[PDB]
Amino acid sequence: NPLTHSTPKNFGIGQAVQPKRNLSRYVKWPEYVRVQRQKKILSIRLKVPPTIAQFQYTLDRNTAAETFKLFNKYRPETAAEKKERLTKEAAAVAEGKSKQDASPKPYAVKYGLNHVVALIENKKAKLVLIANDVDPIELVVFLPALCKKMGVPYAIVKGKARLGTLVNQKTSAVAALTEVRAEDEAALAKLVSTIDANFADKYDEVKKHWGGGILGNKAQAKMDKRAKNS
Amino acid sequence: GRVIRNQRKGAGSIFTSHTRLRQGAAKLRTLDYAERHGYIRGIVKQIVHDSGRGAPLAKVVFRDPYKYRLREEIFIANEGVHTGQFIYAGKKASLNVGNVLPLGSVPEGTIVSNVEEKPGDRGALARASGNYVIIIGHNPDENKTRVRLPSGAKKVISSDARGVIGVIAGGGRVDKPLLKAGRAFHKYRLKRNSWPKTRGVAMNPVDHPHGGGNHQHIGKASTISRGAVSGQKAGLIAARRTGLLRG
Amino acid sequence: KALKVRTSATFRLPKTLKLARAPKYASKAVPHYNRLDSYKVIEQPITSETAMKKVEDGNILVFQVSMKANKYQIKKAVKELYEVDVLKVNTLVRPNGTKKAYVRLTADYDALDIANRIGYI
Amino acid sequence: GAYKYLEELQRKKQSDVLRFLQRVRVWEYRQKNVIHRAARPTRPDKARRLGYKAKQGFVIYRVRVRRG
Amino acid sequence: RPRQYATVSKTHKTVSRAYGGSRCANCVKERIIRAFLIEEQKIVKKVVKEQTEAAK
RNA sequence: CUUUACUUAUUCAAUGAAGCGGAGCUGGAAUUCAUUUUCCACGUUCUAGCAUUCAAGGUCCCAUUCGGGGCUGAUCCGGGU
RNA sequence: UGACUGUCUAAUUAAAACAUAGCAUUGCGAUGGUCAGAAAGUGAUGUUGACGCAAUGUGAUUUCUGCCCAGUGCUCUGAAU
RNA sequence: AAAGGGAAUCCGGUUAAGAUUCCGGAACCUGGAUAUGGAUUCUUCACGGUAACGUAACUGAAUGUGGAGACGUCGGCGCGA
Ligand SMILES: [Mg+2]
Ligand SMILES: [Mg+2]
Ligand SMILES: [Mg+2]
Ligand SMILES: [Mg+2]
Ligand SMILES: [Mg+2]
Ligand SMILES: [Mg+2]
Ligand SMILES: [Mg+2]
Ligand SMILES: [Mg+2]
Ligand SMILES: [Mg+2]
Ligand SMILES: [Mg+2]
Ligand SMILES: [Mg+2]
Ligand SMILES: [Mg+2]
Ligand SMILES: [Mg+2]
Ligand SMILES: [Mg+2]
Ligand SMILES: [Mg+2]
Ligand SMILES: [Mg+2]
Ligand SMILES: [Mg+2]
Ligand SMILES: [Mg+2]
Ligand SMILES: [Mg+2]
């Protein structure tokens, strides 16, 4: 084409006003964006104790998917299912003449912090899931130690939202299985065996290890430069 | 018993500057990628007179690197710059009078002006007329530069602080006698209300520490402590010596 | 992870949806009537000797009008009440706090006959 | 219940576990406004025992005041 | 006066040359001469720089 | 009861928070010493001109609609302005 | 007697008093000097930068400014049970 | 800001007392709508002059640049009312 030519612009210094580049690294973000970014920066710059940072070791993706596959079989009743079984019980009370033999025994996950803590204390919990992302952390930070103390198996698992979805909440912060049906006892035993290997059997060694201390990108670069050069 | 005249200057009622006619804050160009990595060419379009300042100001127009427009900066004109002169500002600038380049990238004995104290505060040192800063040192292991200021003070600045080559224009201004209170009146009329100065010995004792008495004398010593308080410091504050500078 | 390519280093407030008001009850639900209609505007004629010399000579009807009426409202009120067409309105606030309008009718209308039809002179 | 554990844990203010959280939280509270709305109590047990029930109409405000 | 320029026609506010009512026929002449000569010296500088970087 | 290292608290300053930090083509006075032990340079200096339309070009796709969207031009990574 | 022009005690003092230019001394290189504010993410100088700002003394020009650092004041990389 | 910057109104007459405001004549400015004539157009967005520039017109968004607004005081000289 003899009508089109090659201009190329000289985007150096002092020539050819600069093109639109991705300036997302340099955006003056809102103050809440900066606070929530520098907060997760500051929580890993400082030397975290071993009571926090026994969190951020989380149940990994395959065994968390297995854990939620088991725990979704024991979802609690929705409001619609509660209304259906309450109508079924009101039928058997009014005309069926059956006392408490209308609905069968429920198998469901246990949830709520006080309820789950009391189940751990009374040694009824067969498996406890602890959300890694609660705020304040003081609500669950005693729970690995309490679960190790009463011998129930715990798993610090990723997502208070994910734990809330299986209990039909927005956020659950713990979940617990206290009893399963007969067909899930082998699945629960396999899960407890692969969860205890990461959480309860590593507790006494994680209890001595401080987390954090992580330098930034630039500071780590200029620290391994000095380490290499000395 | 009365608040005295040097104490009254901090409230800043009538003692503010008279800044109607001033061209703007005479500052260096802001430290950007062009000035930090290469150079940028601006053009002197006017050498104007600043009011209340003894030195002229060079209105130097640069091109904005990121938006198509023109960014006009107000430099203090070094002595020798002219209209239509290309002013090259940055690290890779050449050693010509008027260029704005860092103190690390100049030789020893270079004479700069409008030179910074910290890299990027846009001109702090040697800005009055005829004044200059001599570059007497470099310390590349700590990125410093030893300079000699107009007062004789040796100062250590960063080597990334900038300065404009040359002496500030308008030199030799104080060598002419003002000859009259009219010329002093019109001098201070565009600076600030620091004139005329009544002597404190002419005052009453309520107006000044020096005031009062049947004879105009000072009474106590004029040399006042540095740790003295506001209201006592009317004399020679924290004087190391007094009398004529002879040995 | 796709990241939004921001060519500006400024964050601005996003254009969220602004809904219109859909109130559960009206603010007053009985609207006020016309606060300044033709009878509120044209209060009374002015029948001084000067104001009557303006009627048969200058084709000008002199009125005392509302203090809240502008020349559009005075023109509309004179056209609506007295069925004339108005060439000009010249108002002044009198030194007793009333307003006086000099309403010049067009040459089609004789202001002395309009004044006679109204009732004064 | 968990609030007994929160009660006994909050008393240990010079332990490592709360000393870290005091630092990490005092930075963030300083970065926010002087009077700002708290979305939920950072001491839920202390809120409950001082009167707060977690329902509509109960509000937490965080606030900093100059010492001395 | 500055708002009277809104009243008059386009002829009264400009000259038919480039930079009509902005520049004054010798400034325009200088801008043209400078634009021609510097953009030829740029070509000369380009081939001299290419020669000197192609020699070694 | 001495010194200097870290940065995230705290303090200072600037900017429309634009090019920060690390790593990557040539070149050599690395005598490649088989290896970038190894450093510097990152498109602009006769001239009071001009520089803007997601950029021309190169290339791919559309389903092509006389137009549109990618990649590149303008290296990659880290979102620490 | 004050160099001069100028200024002031409105309503008893217009002066030889105040100011002045000239001279001199002092402090300060900004994380600063001098001075405000109850405080402040606060101010004046300062749209400033030693030919500048701030504190004083003397008071055009000519010709000079002698001795005393014991006292008091100011100041000093200085003395270390 | 009724003394600074500023879109545009003048003459004649008129009242006991109003007028650059009323009346008569003659204008101008701003905002809006919009038709007709002209102009430009098969070289689609005019032409002449070497040129300074001329004309009744004679497309021009973003963006940029420039001008006007917009400027001391004194002295004599020139021109006008
Ligand atoms: Mg932080
Ligand atoms: Mg001011
Ligand atoms: Mg004096
Ligand atoms: Mg006296
Ligand atoms: Mg009136
Ligand atoms: Mg009126
Ligand atoms: Mg920036
Ligand atoms: Mg006298
Ligand atoms: Mg008197
Ligand atoms: Mg008298
Ligand atoms: Mg005197
Ligand atoms: Mg004398
Ligand atoms: Mg003596
Ligand atoms: Mg005016
Ligand atoms: Mg008249
Ligand atoms: Mg009159
Ligand atoms: Mg008229
Ligand atoms: Mg036609
Ligand atoms: Mg024509």
How were these coordinates obtained?
Answer: cryo-EM
Pair type for strands B236-237 and B223-224:
parallel
Chain F, protein-covered positions (CB within 7 A): 6-10, 13-23, 42-52, 54-58, 73-74, 78-81
- Tell me how far apart the alpha carbons of residues E22 and E15 are, in angstroms, rounded to a whole number: 9
Closest CA to A108 of A77, A74, A80: A74
Instruction: Kindly report the nearest CA distance between residue D24 and chain A, in angstroms.
Output: 7
Q: If you measure from the C-alpha of residue E6 to the centroid of ligand 19, how many angstroms do you get, rounded to a whole number? A: 23
CA of B204 to C1' of G10 (A): 21
C12: buried, middle or exposed (CB in 10 Å: 19+, 13-18, 0-12)? Answer: exposed
Q: Chain C residues with CB inside 8 Å of A21's CB?
A: 7
Instruction: Find, in chain C, the residue whose alpha carbon is nearest to that of A33.
Output: C11
Alpha-carbon torsion angle A68, A70, A73, A75, nearest 10: -40
Closest CB to A14 among B38, B66, B67: B38
Integer CA distances (angstroms), B62 to A227, B43, B65, in order? 44, 7, 9
Which DSSP category does D65 fall into? -
Residue D39: what residue type?
A
Distance (Å, whole) CA B54 – CA A76: 85
In Å, how far are A77, A161, C46, C96 from C67, measured between CA atoms?
Answer: 73, 67, 15, 12
Question: Taking a contact as any Cβ pair under 8 Å apart, which residues of chain A between 7 and 66 contact chain B?
Answer: 12-14, 17-18
Distance CA C106, CA C113 (A): 13
Query: What DSSP string describes B76-129?
Result: EPBBTB-TT-EEEEETT--S-TT-EEEGGGS-TT-EEESB-SSTTS---BS-ST
Q: Which helix (H) or strand (E) holds C82?
A: helix C71-82
The number of residues in chain D equals 68
Helix (H, G, I), strand (E, B) or coil at A128: strand
Separation between Cα atoms, residue C82 and residue C110, nearest integer Å: 12
Classify E5 as helix, strand or coil: helix
Pairing of strands B39-49, B86-90: antiparallel
CA distances from D54 to B168, B173, D44, D45, D49 (A): 70, 77, 9, 11, 12
Is B22 near strand G, with its CB below 7 A from some atom of it? yes
Torsion angle defined by CA atoms of residues B101, B103, B105 and B111, in that order, rounded to the nearest 10 degrees: 80
DSSP tag of A19:
-
CB B231 within 8 A of CB B246: no
B33 touches chain A (CB under 8 A): yes
Query: Quick check: B55 and B77 in contact, CB under 8 A?
Result: yes
Contact C11 A28 (CB under 8 A): yes
Distance B39 CA to H70 C1' (A): 36
B7 CB less than 7 Å from any atom of strand G: yes
Report how far Cα B48 is from the mean position of its chain's Cα atoms: 18
Beta strand A127-131 pairing with A154-157: parallel
The structure was resolved to a resolution in Å of 3.0
Residue B77, both tokens: 């004109």
Closest CA to A206 of A214, A197, A215: A197
User: Which residues in D lie closer than 8 A to residue A142 (C-beta atoms)?
Assistant: 2, 5, 9
Q: Which of A48, A51, A138 sits opposite D6 (nearest CB)?
A: A138
Question: Which residues neighbour A157 within 8 Å (Cβ) at sequence distance 6 or greater?
Answer: A58, A59, A64, A67, A129, A130, A131, A132, A163
Q: Choose among A144, A151, A172: nearest CA to A55.
A: A144
- Would you call A14 and B67 a contact, using CB atoms and an 8 Å cutoff? no
